Design a protein around this ligand. Structure first.
Ligand SMILES: CC(=O)N[C@@H]1[C@@H](O)[C@H](O[C@@H]2O[C@H](C(=O)O)[C@@H](O[C@H]3O[C@H](CO)[C@@H](O)[C@H](O)[C@H]3NC(C)=O)[C@H](O)[C@H]2O)[C@@H](CO)O[C@@H]1O
Ligand SMILES: *[C@@H]1O[C@H](CO)[C@@H](O[C@@H]2O[C@H](CO)[C@@H](O[C@@H]3O[C@H](CO)[C@@H](O)[C@H](O)[C@@H]3O)[C@H](O)[C@H]2NC(C)=O)[C@H](O)[C@H]1NC(C)=O
Ligand SMILES: O=c1ccn([C@@H]2O[C@H](COP(=O)(O)OP(=O)(O)O)[C@@H](O)[C@H]2O)c(=O)[nH]1
Ligand SMILES: O=c1ccn([C@@H]2O[C@H](COP(=O)(O)OP(=O)(O)O)[C@@H](O)[C@H]2O)c(=O)[nH]1
Ligand SMILES: *[C@@H]1O[C@H](CO)[C@@H](O)[C@H](O)[C@H]1NC(C)=O
Lengths: 563, 568
């Protein structure tokens, strides 16, 4: 009845397997004899490198296949044949009950439908280009369509280095893409010459598709081709305010991710396209959604958009790209967290966490579903930072402090939000602690501490460095005399995979470095300084950067001092 | 047709772009007082128009909300005979009882091949995602009795369940929970709620519990939800597959707790895991949701039409914060427009603006001292005197601008000649600044792009004797304002001062010739919600300015901080 195409979580899913508070995903082993694409290798590595990965099939309540399902067009070279038999012959398929199937392309040439090929059954599919009429509202996940060269880890850090007012550029609406003479889905692109204008709405098209386009060409293509080679595509997206992202053969396109990297606000024209992560992300804040049926009056609608609205849309586009779309690892983690936020619908993330800084991938609701228990959402609410802090001392002396100090915890080998981590070899006066906490009250998201160290990029060894003496700037503050949020403790314990912490334990140090890496990654802001044993730090930093994919540490040469 | 969405079965040629981005709703001319009040609320709004050829949506004058005596065939005949059916391409329908005595279909049973439905109880299977809207079910008890606006806090009971005609399984599980825990869970039996040897009044008993249980007895949507929200207790919907009303825009995760029907014996343990602060937040959110969306039929109609209008004009959709903020936190909210944590590089600089009336001998010193700093791009000088002309050919790029009128607020206009983001406003009187100080100020602004970075430090204090704010500068123990003289700030702040300034503050500062820095600080501290960074009848006028600015805003946006930034 409800177990067919109209599957939902309460019908086509086994909550009892996930009833244990242990949400884990299991990856099938490779057959070592079937071709596999690089994008699916990236997806599998993202799942396997995640904290949700487990080897034991019994413990996991989410399954992801090892067969390449991303490319499901028989005209493509990554199509895998006889996949129906290979998916029905699996021992743990179980009609695909708790199975997550990733997909990026589907459909044949005459009609690009959702021809996944094999019987999905009750499994949920994270398809790239999903029509809203064929999308399960709370079961499927709409994911972006990424390239084979899309980064596995790290990111390109966006494009918008300056936030300029007025939020306008040399052109307004831009599009340099192929127009298809024959087929399905080229109506909107072919009807762009109607609204093509001067250096305000510049819409370029190309008729050179395939090899038989000459027979089907018309008189319009001759002029278009010469004018097509006038502007560079990457440059055009950077001199533009609104980036048109119409429908080609399929609803999704690579141009959406390029519009978000370029910081231009995308104006989607694809009718009925479930936008990437639509169920958790508000797409009226980072993009303009306009029907392609009203194509002629689109530029007037774009002009009607106020400058403050444009500024908000551009910044939201930048944040959304840098949060949920920068790398395929981020996409996979976003899909997995969206899955996780449907098992226990009281320990999940609200719509404000997904659509505001730092994003849902760094806000774990298992810690708390109350926005006041996090350091990021004080201004959005009418709240103030907590006035008391818990002092945590790790002992392997003086400990003279009474003001602002609700309790002292000494660890031998927490109620308040703020946590003071102190090393027994560090002596700090109570006035200094009070000043540090007062500074922290203005910046609850960051780490406020007295010791500070910075890093450098040595070209000779192509290796990240670590300096600790007479630095002209800094990008890390040690946790030995620092104030931060207890949610950072929770995030360090329950977010980073076991390998980094294991190496930290075995090397007897490098926990503060990883803490600073984590806080700089989540906040994207530098910390604040207030006023043989040297060799392994560089290896620690290199390993951490390799795991992250980039160096989240950001330099800063300020120093907050009392007046 | 369950497959219908707004991109296939809806018509967008009929209503297109208009300067006022509001859809226009036309009402046909033909019973329940409910539908009469709904139509009257729609008519007296901004959406009602005539000239059917110009409006987009249509709301038939046929009784649809009550399905007990709906006469489904008669309703289908009426919809066909509407003479403007057009396969129901744009028509909007309202319902709150989508259930039938034989079976509860959780949706309207009329054909409605493409009609738009605003129903009360929607399942996740019978609800079109982007097409339909889930509306609250209206309980007359909301307006029949006016419960006191009791504040959040501790209550006698913890969990409560005041429903009539539940299924035996639910009641048995609730009674097991009550005998297991006791003194916190109160299951009430059959406007009067009768426990064993004790009587409670139904509207007012809900005020004594911090959690109220809403179950699925029939139609998947119960009128008890509105009463639970009105009384302030957090609703615990244990009706699985139920889409909460206005879940498209409202955040029900901060106002209610949803527990699956299977884990009903686990309800108490789940509710014990919630801290008290989130309890208070959820109670306030529930009260706000009732007073804004559930209170009257007018609120329901307005919210429904507004959601539809946002769907048809996505670029104009109202903000999430406007959707789900009580006015208290709405006034206390910030919503910083410059929220991206990006650090602009050294390639660009700052367009320095120097405002002068007279003293063209310190101004040359000012230009000489400012020009020595690196990263400076454009040294704009604004000339306000209508009488005295600037020295021509006696003065890296420099532009001198003449003002139409001599107003002090001409240093804050957004000039198109500014191609950078940082703006250094500096006056002639300030001369004890070196190049390194300005350079370090710019460096500090790089990490704090959305706040003032000013060198002078002036604060404000509260006076008990006069009960009015005062302007304090003699002693420095904390800083709440930095004067616009030698103050780095974003050009968007110039835009805000020039255009988005509430009240008559711009006119007032123009008239009084003084107090521009205080107004700038007020506006920036309100818009950004962050303090300022200091880098290391005169007084009466400043105090009067502070008091006036506090009066116009309704509060004091300034925040006291004891920290300054200095070179490492
Ligand atoms: C006269 C006539 O009807 N001709 C068509 C002919 O144009 C079709 O040929 C094309 O096949 C292309 C192909 O490479 O197989 C196909 O490109 C698509 O497939 C590649 C992978 O092979 C994908 O990477 C591309 O993204 C995808 N291109 C898109 C999205 O347009 C192209 O679409 C076809 O035009 C032929 C089928 O092969 O059918 C007739 O002969
Ligand atoms: C930034 O400025 C805006 C206005 O420009 C401030 O909003 C105002 O906030 C005050 C309270 O802080 C509101 O006063 C209240 O008015 C209601 C009636 O409207 C009254 O019943 C209350 O007792 C209270 O006096 C005022 O209405 C409100 N104005 C608007 C237009 O929203 C905002 O608070 C400022 N932000 C900061 C951080 O200072
Ligand atoms: O001058 C051009 C034209 C296209 N593209 C790339 O081509 C893709 C989209 O073009 P196309 O018309 O092929 O889109 P499709 O309809 O094939 O998805 C994107 O990755 C663009 O970056 C490009 O880089 N430069
Ligand atoms: O009619 C006038 C008088 C003064 N100013 C401006 O007022 C500032 C000087 O302020 P003031 O002399 O009060 O500074 P202070 O003496 O307090 O340091 C300069 O920038 C002038 O351009 C002005 O714009 N119009
Ligand atoms: C678009 O911006 C880039 C900046 O990276 C600039 O080099 C280019 O010249 C601009 N385009 C045109 C047509 O000038």
């Amino acid at each position: 009845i409800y177990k067919g195409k109209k599957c939902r979580m309460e019908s086509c899913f086994d909550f009892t397997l996930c009833k244990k508070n242990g949400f884990k995903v299991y990856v099938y082993p490779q057959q070592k004899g079937e071709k596999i694409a690089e994008s699916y290798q990236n997806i599998l590595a993202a799942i396997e490198g995640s904290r949700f990965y487990t080897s034991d099939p019994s413990q996991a309540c989410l399954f992801v296949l090892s067969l390449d399902t991303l490319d499901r067009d028989q005209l493509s070279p990554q199509y895998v044949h006889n996949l129906r038999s290979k998916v029905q012959s699996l021992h743990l398929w179980n009609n695909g009950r708790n199975h997550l199937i990733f997909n990026l392309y589907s459909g044949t040439w005459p009609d690009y439908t959702e021809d996944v090929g094999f019987d999905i059954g009750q499994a949920m599919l994270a398809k790239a280009s999903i029509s809203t009429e064929n999308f399960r509202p709370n079961f499927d996940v709409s994911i972006p369509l990424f390239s084979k060269d899309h980064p596995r880890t790290g990111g390109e850090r966006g494009f918008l280095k300056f936030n300029t007012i007025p939020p306008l550029r040399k052109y307004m609406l831009v599009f340099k893409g192929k127009r298809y003479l024959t087929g399905i889905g080229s109506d909107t692109r072919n009807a762009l010459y109607h609204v093509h204008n001067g250096e305000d709405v510049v819409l370029l098209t190309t008729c050179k598709h395939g090899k038989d386009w000459q027979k089907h060409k018309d008189s319009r293509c001759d002029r278009d081709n010469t004018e097509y080679e006038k502007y560079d595509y990457r440059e055009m997206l950077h001199n533009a305010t609104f980036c048109l992202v119409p429908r080609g053969r399929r609803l999704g396109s690579f141009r959406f991710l390029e519009a978000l990297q370029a910081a231009c606000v995308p104006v989607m024209l694809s009718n009925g396209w479930e936008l990437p992560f639509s169920e958790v992300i508000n797409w009226n804040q980072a993009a303009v959604i306009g029907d392609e049926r009203l194509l002629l009056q689109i530029p007037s609608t774009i002009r009607s958009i106020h400058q403050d609205k444009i500024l908000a849309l551009r910044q939201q586009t930048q944040f959304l790209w840098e949060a949920y779309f920068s790398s395929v690892e981020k996409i996979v983690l976003t899909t997995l967290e969206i899955i996780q936020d449907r098992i226990f619908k009281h320990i999940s993330r609200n719509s404000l966490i997904w659509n505001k800084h730092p994003g849902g991938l760094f806000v774990l609701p298992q810690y708390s579903s109350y926005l006041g228990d996090f350091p990021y959402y004080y201004a959005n609410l009418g709240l103030k930072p907590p006035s008391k802090f818990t002092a945590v001392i790790h002992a392997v002396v003086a400990a003279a402090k009474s003001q602002y100090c609700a309790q002292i915890i000494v660890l031998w080998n927490i109620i308040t939000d703020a946590v003071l981590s102190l090393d027994e070899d560090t002596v700090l006066s109570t006035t200094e602690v009070d000043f540090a906490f007062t500074v922290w009250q203005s910046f609850p998201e960051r780490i406020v501490g007295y010791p500070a160290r910075s890093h450098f990029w040595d070209n000779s060894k192509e290796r990240w460095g670590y300096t600790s003496k007479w630095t002209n700037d800094y990008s890390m503050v040690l946790t030995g005399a620092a104030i931060y949020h207890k949610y950072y403790h929770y995030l360090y314990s329950h977010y980073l995979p076991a390998s980094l912490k294991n190496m930290v334990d075995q090397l007897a140090n490098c926990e503060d470095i990883l803490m600073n890496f984590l806080v700089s990654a989540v906040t994207k802001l530098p910390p604040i300084k207030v006023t043989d044993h040297f060799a392994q730090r560089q290896s620690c930093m290199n390993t951490f950067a390799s795991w992250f994919g980039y160096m989240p540490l950001i330099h800063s040469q300020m120093r907050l001092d009392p007046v | 047709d369950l497959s219908c969405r707004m991109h296939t079965c809806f018509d967008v040629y009929r209503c297109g772009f208009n300067p006022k981005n509001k859809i226009k709703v036309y009402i046909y001319a033909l019973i329940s007082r409910e539908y009469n009040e709904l139509l009257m609320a729609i008519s007296d709004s901004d959406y009602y128009t005539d000239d059917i050829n110009r409006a987009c949506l249509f709301v038939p004058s046929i009784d649809v909300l009550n399905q007990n005596t709906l006469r489904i065939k008669e309703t289908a005949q009426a919809m066909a005979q509407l003479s403007r059916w057009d396969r129901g391409t744009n028509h909007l329908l309202f319902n709150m009882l989508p259930g039938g005595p034989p079976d509860y279909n959780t949706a309207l049973d009329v054909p409605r091949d493409r009609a738009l439905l605003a129903g009360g109880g929607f399942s996740t299977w019978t609800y079109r995602q982007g097409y339909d809207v889930s509306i609250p079910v209206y309980s007359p008890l909301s307006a029949e009795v006016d419960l006191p606006e009791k504040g959040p806090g501790p209550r006698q009971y913890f969990l409560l369940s005041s429903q009539v005609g539940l299924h035996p399984e639910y009641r048995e599980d609730l009674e097991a929970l009550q005998v297991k825990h006791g003194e916190s869970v109160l299951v009430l039996d059959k406007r009067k709620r009768c426990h064993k040897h004790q009587v409670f009044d139904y509207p007012q008993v809900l005020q004594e519990a911090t959690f109220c249980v809403v179950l699925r007895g029939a139609r998947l949507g119960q009128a008890v939800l509105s009463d639970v929200l009105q009384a302030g207790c957090v609703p615990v919907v244990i009706a699985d597959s139920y889409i909460l009303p206005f879940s498209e825009v409202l955040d029900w995760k901060r106002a209610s707790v949803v527990v699956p029907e299977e884990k009903m014996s686990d309800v108490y343990s789940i509710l014990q895991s919630i801290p008290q602060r989130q309890i208070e937040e959820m109670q306030r959110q529930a009260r706000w949701f009732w007073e804004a969306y559930f209170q009257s039929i007018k609120a329901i109609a307005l919210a429904t039409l507004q959601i539809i209008n946002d769907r048809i004009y996505p670029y104009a959709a109202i903000s999430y914060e406007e959707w789900n903020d009580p006015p208290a936190v709405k006034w206390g909210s910030v919503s910083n427009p410059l929220f991206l944590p990006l650090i602009p590089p050294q390639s660009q600089g700052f367009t320095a603006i120097v405002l002068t009336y007279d003293r063209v001998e310190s101004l040359f010193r000012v230009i000489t001292e400012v020009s020595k700093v690196p990263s400076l791009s454009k040294l704009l000088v604004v000339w306000n005197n209508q009488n005295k002309n600037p020295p021509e050919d006696s003065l890296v790029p420099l532009k001198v601008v003449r003002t139409a009128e001599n107003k002090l607020s001409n240093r804050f206009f957004p000039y198109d000649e500014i191609e950078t983001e940082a703006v250094l406003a500096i006056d002639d009187d300030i001369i004890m600044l070196t190049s390194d100080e300005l350079q370090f100020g710019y460096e500090v602004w790089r990490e704090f792009p959305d706040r003032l970075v000013g060198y002078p430090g002036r604060l404000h204090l509260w006076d008990h004797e006069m009960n009015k704010w005062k302007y304090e500068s003699e002693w420095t123990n904390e800083v709440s304002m930095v004067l616009t003289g030698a103050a780095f700030y974003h050009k968007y702040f110039n835009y805000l001062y020039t255009y988005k300034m509430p009240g008559d503050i711009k006119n007032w500062v123009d008239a009084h010739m003084n107090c521009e820095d205080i107004a700038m600080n007020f506006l920036v501290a309100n818009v950004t919600g962050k303090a300022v960074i200091k880098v290391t009848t005169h007084m009466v006028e400043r105090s009067e300015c502070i008091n006036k600015f506090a009066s116009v805003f309704g509060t004091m946006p300034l925040k006291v901080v004891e920290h300054r930034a200095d070179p490492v």
